[PDB]
Amino acid sequence: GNCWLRQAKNGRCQVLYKTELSKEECCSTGRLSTSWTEEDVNDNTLFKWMIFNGGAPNCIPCKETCENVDCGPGKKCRMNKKNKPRCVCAPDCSNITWKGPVCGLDGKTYRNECALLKARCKEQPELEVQYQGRCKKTCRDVFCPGSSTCVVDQTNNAYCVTCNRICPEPSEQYLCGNDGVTYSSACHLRKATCLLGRSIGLAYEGKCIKAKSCEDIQCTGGKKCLWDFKVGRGRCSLCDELCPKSDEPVCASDNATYASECAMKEAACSSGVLLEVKHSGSCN
Amino acid sequence: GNCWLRQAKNGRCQVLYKTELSKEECCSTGRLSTSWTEEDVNDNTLFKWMIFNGGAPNCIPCKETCENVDCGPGKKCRMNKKNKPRCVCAPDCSNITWKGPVCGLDGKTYRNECALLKARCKEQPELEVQYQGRCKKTCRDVFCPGSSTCVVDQTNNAYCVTCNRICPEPASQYLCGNDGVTYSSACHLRKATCLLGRSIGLAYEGKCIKAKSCEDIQCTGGKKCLWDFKVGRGRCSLCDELCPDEPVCASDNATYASECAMKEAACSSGVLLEVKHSGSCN
Amino acid sequence: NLGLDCDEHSSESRCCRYPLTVDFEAFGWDWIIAPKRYKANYCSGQCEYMFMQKYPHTHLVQQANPRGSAGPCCTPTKMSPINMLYFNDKQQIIYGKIPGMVVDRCGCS
Amino acid sequence: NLGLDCDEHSSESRCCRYPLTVDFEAFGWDWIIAPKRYKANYCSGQCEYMFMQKYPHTHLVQQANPRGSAGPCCTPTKMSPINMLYFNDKQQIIYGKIPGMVVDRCGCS
């Protein structure tokens, strides 16, 4: 006989696992979906079945009930409404003290811990709780557990993360942040950023200088100087990217309308003027 | 520097081909999309750029124009509207005498041969003409080119195919077609089918027998006998497939929930049923 | 575009797509009616360092180097179907689009 | 369901998915904020005959056996992303879904 990884919805056996096997050998393990066909045939019959006829016929599933089914950890075998064995997610929600909503690492709020654990089992193996309560915008009143502290991403979503605060302390690893502050290394910039709770941004490698235009700043490594007229400081930006589409128009800090944020960036790089999105959509 | 397979549409370099290269070395061939970055950096830097920053920055394409571009056969380099080199499909349609529509192997009608050759180049490299004119339904007045002959598929689309004519003789399974004819091999059944122009179908493995009911017929391989009262012959059918719709009228002049529901009723009763027409019988 | 193409006149060592015509009759497969032949192509070449890689997982495995990891293989990263006319088990004439028949692109996975 | 899962103390010889945790700190990558580690998994096992094959093209190469054609390799047939919080080139805090980080399924290609 032949041993197969599954029975498809057409009732046929699919994915050849082993040949020249008895049903007992094929079905000896606890794997739910393993299935068996009795007839020993040649390759080209097998090939014709798998590729041109929807799978092998007379497919006999090893497990018609939950007996001897091993769903593994966090799962349990249950007969469904059509009386077929299924490995469903059944995590242990027993010893969980918090019964309120939680914020998952995926930035989605779950009704409770048990729900997150069930989503962890079904679809997201990496899913964990980063903090209790709903996921929030801004770090205001986000009290992070343990040694973790709050930061926001590019869309102001709050995360509880563990900043690493042990940088190897050192040459010309100096960086000038957009805050006009000089940092000894990227690590320190990163940890200062992590501690501030929001992006500071790299203006240019080297010490910060009191530049009065982009003429005072030399950009290294294919970058161009862009001047921020709102704070009177410059930054070195790549300006290499192209704009592809179903673009969404934006309103920029120069109070002009662009086809897309990308179109805005190009006008910024061309003119040497730093432009940032004021709000989404065209300038009304 | 680094050599890359392409510049992405965001303008950055993607798919590392070679490292520690000059632009001249990287761009020495006629390959259209090959691109180069000047900076030599370590693995973790290349990785950060490729995976987390859209690709390698300062991506310089080897080919800014169609100059020295080798598009290969069937293609030619043309500058697009954004003045960027693209290898477009340009097959040779000059010495083609047939200027009418053609029926492609994909069973789709093309406006002409040249159109088919361009569809061949852009999306279906195996696309060929099976016969001149529009693709047709049924083999009526389908004159297949050369020694090729006409057959229809499951939805009555006409194809011009080369049947297999030299079957290898079997050392000897004989097969019994639904036509009540005994065939020396599957190869022979197929070639009778191909020449007939439509499916005959396997009734059962082995010699045809003059059965008077399904009791005379031994079905092998999990199959069950279904009796066809219209021709007085039996058939071994799998009756294994599951059915998940179509309402239909069966050859027993009864209404079924579906062809699927009909087949199951056939397998249950041991009586061959076929779709007469869609919809209720009343 | 995301993949590299080679022929017999290539001295290319990296993972690459080569031409390969499959003849169904020369296999003896009479149950295929059409086409009699088609361009299947195949992948061949070395997968060292980070070359010709699409997904970051590959690089992470190379670093971890766990037990039984053979390294990246030169393998199809994009497949195309072909249309076929063939005999099914019932020896009926069937037309069908058959997935995973043509290699469009090769890469290191 | 379409794939086979094994662990280290499995005697499964065929192409199979094994567990593997990637630790970003143990690589030293401070530019990744979260997660610090994750289950990446990897593929390992034999690919003989027609076993664990998804696409018909594999079988066809085996028959043709052209020059430089290696046997089928045990390779990912399904990949998943993970969500990551990290520093980009500008050292901005970026959240992003990163494709091709997790192997969901292994097969012979």
* Chain C from 50 to 69: CB within 8 A of any B CB: 50-54, 56, 59
Which chain A residues are closer than 8 Å to B221 by Cβ?
39, 57-58
Same domain, B18 and B90: yes
Provide the greatest CA pair distance for chain C.
Answer: 52
Q: How far apart are the first and last CA of chain C?
A: 17
Which chain D residues are closer than 8 Å to C79 by Cβ?
55, 57
- Exposure string (b/e) for A93-107, b if CB count within 10 Å is 16 or more? eeeeeeeebbbbbbb
Same domain, B92 and B64: yes
**Which chain C residue has its CA at the smallest distance from B200's CA?**
C92
Whether the CB-CB separation of B102 and B129 falls below 8 Å is answered with: yes
Strand A102-104 and strand A2-7: the pairing is unpaired
* Burial class (CB within 10 angstroms; exposed 0-12, middle 13-18, buried 19+) of C54: buried
Q: Which of these, B57, B39, B80, D94, lies nearest to A269 by C-alpha position?
A: B57
What distance in Å separates the CA atoms of residue A23 and residue A95, rounded to the nearest whole number? 42
Phi-psi region of C71 (alpha: psi -120 to 50; beta: other; left: phi over 0): left
Whether the CB-CB separation of A229 and A253 falls below 8 Å is answered with: no
- Exposure string (b/e) for B212-231, b if CB count within 10 Å is 16 or more? eebeebebeebbbbbbbeee
Whether the CB-CB separation of A111 and A101 falls below 8 Å is answered with: yes
Structure tokens at A84: 């077929």
Cβ contact (<8 Å) for B10 and A57?
Answer: no
Chain C touched by D76 (CB under 8 Å): yes
**Which chain A residue has its CA at the smallest distance from D14's CA?**
A17
Who among B106, B153, B201 is closest to C91 (CB)?
B201
* Burial class (CB within 10 angstroms; exposed 0-12, middle 13-18, buried 19+) of A264: buried
The single-letter DSSP state of residue A19 is S
Backbone angles phi, psi at B215, to 5 degrees: -70, -25
What distance in Å separates the CA atoms of residue A216 and residue B226, rounded to the nearest whole number? 92
* Burial class (CB within 10 angstroms; exposed 0-12, middle 13-18, buried 19+) of B128: middle
Whether the CB-CB separation of A35 and A58 falls below 8 Å is answered with: no
What distance in Å separates the CA atoms of residue C1 and residue B277, rounded to the nearest whole number? 50
What distance in Å separates the CA atoms of residue A211 and residue A226, rounded to the nearest whole number? 12
**Which chain C residue has its CA at the smallest distance from D75's CA?**
C109
What distance in Å separates the CA atoms of residue C103 and residue D31, rounded to the nearest whole number? 37
Last residue of a domain, one of B148, B171, B194: B171
Cβ contact (<8 Å) for D88 and B44?
Answer: no
* Chain D from 22 to 41: CB within 8 A of any A CB: 25, 30-31, 33-36, 38-39
What distance in Å separates the CA atoms of residue B274 and residue B259, rounded to the nearest whole number? 8
Which chain B residues are closer than 8 Å to C38 by Cβ?
126
Same domain, A82 and A10: yes
Q: Which of these, B213, B275, B264, B221, lies nearest to B239 by C-alpha position?
A: B264
Residues 6+ apart with CB under 8 A from A146: A162
What distance in Å separates the CA atoms of residue A149 and residue A129, rounded to the nearest whole number? 14
> At residue C22, what is the residue type?
V
Which chain D residues are closer than 8 Å to B57 by Cβ?
89
Whether the CB-CB separation of B251 and B270 falls below 8 Å is answered with: no
What distance in Å separates the CA atoms of residue C4 and residue C11, rounded to the nearest whole number? 13
What distance in Å separates the CA atoms of residue A121 and residue B20, rounded to the nearest whole number? 45
Strand A224-228 and strand A202-205: the pairing is unpaired
Q: Which of these, A61, A93, A63, lies nearest to A78 by C-alpha position?
A: A63
Which chain D residues are closer than 8 Å to B39 by Cβ?
none
Resolution in A: 2.3
Q: How far is CA B200 from the centre of its chain?
A: 22
The single-letter DSSP state of residue B77 is E
Whether the CB-CB separation of B63 and B69 falls below 8 Å is answered with: yes
Peptide-bond breaks in chain D following residues (C–N over 2.5 A): none
Last residue of a domain, one of B74, B96, B118: B96
Whether the CB-CB separation of B185 and B154 falls below 8 Å is answered with: no
What distance in Å separates the CA atoms of residue A96 and residue A93, rounded to the nearest whole number? 6
* Chain C from 1 to 60: CB within 8 A of any D CB: 18, 20, 22, 27, 40, 42, 44-45, 54-57, 60
Cβ contact (<8 Å) for A53 and C98?
Answer: no
The single-letter DSSP state of residue A79 is E
Q: Which residue of C33, C86, C89, C94 is the best one to mutate when testing the A interface, meaning the one whose CB has the most A CBs within 10 A?
A: C89
Who among D52, D82, D93 is closest to A198 (CB)?
D93
Structure tokens at B81: 């509207």
What distance in Å separates the CA atoms of residue B13 and residue B31, rounded to the nearest whole number? 15
Who among C31, C34, C51 is closest to B16 (CB)?
C51
> At residue B90, what is the residue type?
A
The single-letter DSSP state of residue B112 is S
Structure tokens at D2: 């379409």
What distance in Å separates the CA atoms of residue A42 and residue A2, rounded to the nearest whole number? 11
Cβ contact (<8 Å) for D52 and A17?
Answer: yes
Whether omega for the bond prior to residue C66 falls within 30 degrees of 0, making it cis, is no
Q: How many CB pairs under 8 A join A and B?
A: 42
Structure tokens at A231: 């704070």
The single-letter DSSP state of residue B47 is H
The single-letter DSSP state of residue B125 is T
> At residue A198, what is the residue type?
R
- Please give, rounded to a whole number of angstroms, the shortest distance from the CA of C106 to a CA of chain B: 12
Q: What is the dihedral of CA B139, B142, B146, B149, to 10 degrees?
A: 0
What distance in Å separates the CA atoms of residue A125 and residue D35, rounded to the nearest whole number? 12
Question: Apex CA A237: angle with CA A235 and CA A243, to 5°?
Answer: 145
- The DSSP line for D40-93 is --EEE-B--TTTTB-SHHHHHHHHH--TT-PPP-EEEEEEEEEEEEEE-TT--E
Chain A touched by D90 (CB under 8 Å): yes
- The DSSP line for A86-139 is EEEE----TT----S-EEETTS-EESSHHHHHHHHHHT-TT--EEEES---BSS
> At residue C83, what is the residue type?
N
Q: Which residue of C75, C78, C83, C104 is the best one to mutate when testing the D interface, meaning the one whose CB has the most D CBs within 10 A?
A: C75
Cβ contact (<8 Å) for D89 and B57?
Answer: yes
Question: Apex CA A57: angle with CA A52 and CA A61, to 5°?
Answer: 125
HSE (side-chain half, CA atoms, 13 Å) at A210: 0
3-state SS track over chain C: CCCCECCCCCCCCECEEECCEEECHHHCCCCEEECCEEECCEEECECCCCCCECCHHHHHHHHHCCCCCCCCCEEEEEEEEEEEEEECCCCCEEEEEEEEEEEEEEEEC
Whether the CB-CB separation of B60 and B38 falls below 8 Å is answered with: yes
Q: How many CB pairs under 8 A join B and D?
A: 14
Backbone angles phi, psi at A120, to 5 degrees: -60, -45
Whether the CB-CB separation of A225 and A216 falls below 8 Å is answered with: no
What distance in Å separates the CA atoms of residue D11 and residue D107, rounded to the nearest whole number? 17
Q: Where are the alpha helices (DSSP H) in A123-257?
A: 186-196
Q: Which of these, B155, D64, A123, A270, lies nearest to C40 by C-alpha position?
A: D64
Who among C45, C67, C100 is closest to D56 (CB)?
C100
Q: How far is CA A194 from the centre of its chain?
A: 19
CA distances from residue B208 to B176, B217, B224, C37 in whole angstroms, order as listed? 5, 9, 16, 34
Question: Apex CA B209: angle with CA B204 and CA B211, to 5°?
Answer: 95
What distance in Å separates the CA atoms of residue C25 and residue C35, rounded to the nearest whole number? 10
Chain A touched by B147 (CB under 8 Å): no
Backbone angles phi, psi at D46, to 5 degrees: -80, 150
Total residue length of chain A? 284
Residues 6+ apart with CB under 8 A from A284: A251
Cβ contact (<8 Å) for D29 and B44?
Answer: yes
What distance in Å separates the CA atoms of residue C50 and residue D28, rounded to the nearest whole number? 19
Whether the CB-CB separation of A178 and A196 falls below 8 Å is answered with: no
Which chain A residues are closer than 8 Å to D93 by Cβ?
151-154, 193-194, 198-199
Whether omega for the bond prior to residue C72 falls within 30 degrees of 0, making it cis, is no
CA distances from residue D74 to B148, C14, C109 in whole angstroms, order as listed? 43, 19, 10
The single-letter DSSP state of residue D105 is E
Structure tokens at D106: 């292994």
Beta bridge partners of B60: B36
What distance in Å separates the CA atoms of residue B158 and residue C94, rounded to the nearest whole number? 12
Whether the CB-CB separation of B13 and B43 falls below 8 Å is answered with: no
Cβ contact (<8 Å) for A240 and B39?
Answer: no
Cβ contact (<8 Å) for C89 and A51?
Answer: no
CA distances from residue C43 to C8, C39, C76 in whole angstroms, order as listed? 13, 13, 6
Residue A235, H or E segment:
strand A233-237
Name the neighbours of A, counting chains with at least 3 Cβ pairs within 8 A.
B, C, D
What distance in Å separates the CA atoms of residue B282 and residue A98, rounded to the nearest whole number? 63
HSE (side-chain half, CA atoms, 13 Å) at C12: 21
Whether the CB-CB separation of B149 and B195 falls below 8 Å is answered with: yes
CA distances from residue C14 to B183, C46, C48, C77 in whole angstroms, order as listed? 51, 5, 8, 15
Q: Which residue of B58, B60, B264 is the best one to mutate when testing the A interface, meaning the one whose CB has the most A CBs within 10 A?
A: B58
**Which chain C residue has its CA at the smallest distance from D63's CA?**
C27
What distance in Å separates the CA atoms of residue C7 and residue C14, rounded to the nearest whole number? 13
Long-range contacts of B186-189 (CB under 8 A, 24+ apart): B186/C30, B186/C31, B186/C91, B187/C30, B189/C91
Whether the CB-CB separation of C13 and C65 falls below 8 Å is answered with: no
What distance in Å separates the CA atoms of residue C24 and residue C33, rounded to the nearest whole number? 9
Structure tokens at A80: 């469904």
- Exposure string (b/e) for C5-28, b if CB count within 10 Å is 16 or more? bbeeeeeeebbbbbebebebeeee
Q: Which residue of D2, D9, D46, D60 is the best one to mutate when testing the C interface, meaning the one whose CB has the most C CBs within 10 A?
A: D60
CATH of the domain at B134: 3.30.60.30
CB atoms closer than 10 angstroms to residue A213: 11
In this structure, is the dihedral angle defined by the CA atoms of residues B151, B154, B156 and B157, taken in order, positive or negative? negative
Which chain D residues are closer than 8 Å to A161 by Cβ?
33-34, 85
- The DSSP line for B148-191 is -EEEE-TT-BEEEE-----PPPP----EEETTS-EESSHHHHHH
The 3-state DSSP composition of chain B as helix, strand, coil percent (nearest 5) reads: 15, 25, 55
Q: Which of these, A267, A265, A181, A275, lies nearest to A228 by C-alpha position?
A: A275
The experimental method behind these coordinates is X-ray
Name the neighbours of C, counting chains with at least 3 Cβ pairs within 8 A.
A, B, D
Question: Apex CA B24: angle with CA B20 and CA B26, to 5°?
Answer: 55
Which chain B residues are closer than 8 Å to D94 by Cβ?
52
Q: Which of these, D101, B127, D75, B32, lies nearest to C76 by C-alpha position?
A: D75
Chain D touched by C107 (CB under 8 Å): no
Strand A85-89 and strand A75-79: the pairing is antiparallel
Cβ contact (<8 Å) for B193 and C49?
Answer: no
Name the neighbours of D, counting chains with at least 3 Cβ pairs within 8 A.
A, B, C
What distance in Å separates the CA atoms of residue B156 and residue A271, rounded to the nearest whole number? 64
Residues 6+ apart with CB under 8 A from B7: B13, B14, B33, B35, B59, B61
> At residue D96, what is the residue type?
G
Last residue of a domain, one of B53, B80, B96: B96
Question: What is the residue whose two structure tokens read 């593994």?
Answer: A72
What distance in Å separates the CA atoms of residue C30 and residue A225, rounded to the nearest whole number? 69
Whether the CB-CB separation of B84 and B94 falls below 8 Å is answered with: no
What distance in Å separates the CA atoms of residue C87 and residue C95, rounded to the nearest whole number? 9
What distance in Å separates the CA atoms of residue A252 and residue A262, rounded to the nearest whole number? 11
Cβ contact (<8 Å) for B199 and C83?
Answer: no
Beta bridge partners of B109: B103
Q: Which of these, A143, A142, A141, A145, lies nearest to A129 by C-alpha position?
A: A145
Phi-psi region of A161 (alpha: psi -120 to 50; beta: other; left: phi over 0): beta
Whether the CB-CB separation of C103 and C15 falls below 8 Å is answered with: no
Strand C16-18 and strand A75-79: the pairing is unpaired
Residue A199: domain span: 171-210
The number of folded domains in chain B is 4
CATH of the domain at A44: 3.90.290.10
Which chain B residues are closer than 8 Å to A222 by Cβ?
38-39, 57-58
- Please give, rounded to a whole number of angstroms, the shortest distance from the CA of A7 to a CA of chain D: 9
